[PDB]
């Protein structure tokens, strides 16, 4: 019944957004809540954010 088939292959690039699931290797799961600016990030005396 099928005369001809056209397969298109899409490459989609997604980074990360709230709702994604992240976890360490220790069985500690989690879901990204909000994406915070570098400005609001807790930083050490060296000035390097986390």
């Amino acid at each position: 019944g099928v005369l001809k088939i056209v397969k298109v292959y899409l490459a989609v690039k997604r980074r990360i957004q709230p709702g994604d699931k992240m976890a360490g290797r220790h069985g500690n799961k989690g879901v990204i809540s909000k994406i915070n600016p570098i400005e609001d990030m807790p930083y050490d005396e060296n000035g390097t954010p986390v």
Partner: protein, 50 residues
């Protein structure tokens, strides 16, 4: 969908994703859109939100 925190919220509310609310209330949006006169007809409303 997956859920997140949103501590800023009052107890009586919840964060609802834009796209989701758009798709969910679609008939309401059509109705209001052609209620105020922003859309000629329901078809036009569909085309607008689409």
């Amino acid at each position: 969908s997956v859920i997140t925190v949103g501590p800023y919220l009052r107890l009586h509310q919840c964060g609802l994703p834009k796209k989701m609310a758009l798709e969910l209330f679609k008939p309401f949006i059509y109705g209001k859109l052609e209620l105020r006169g922003l859309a000629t007809t329901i078809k036009a409303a569909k085309k607008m939100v689409e």
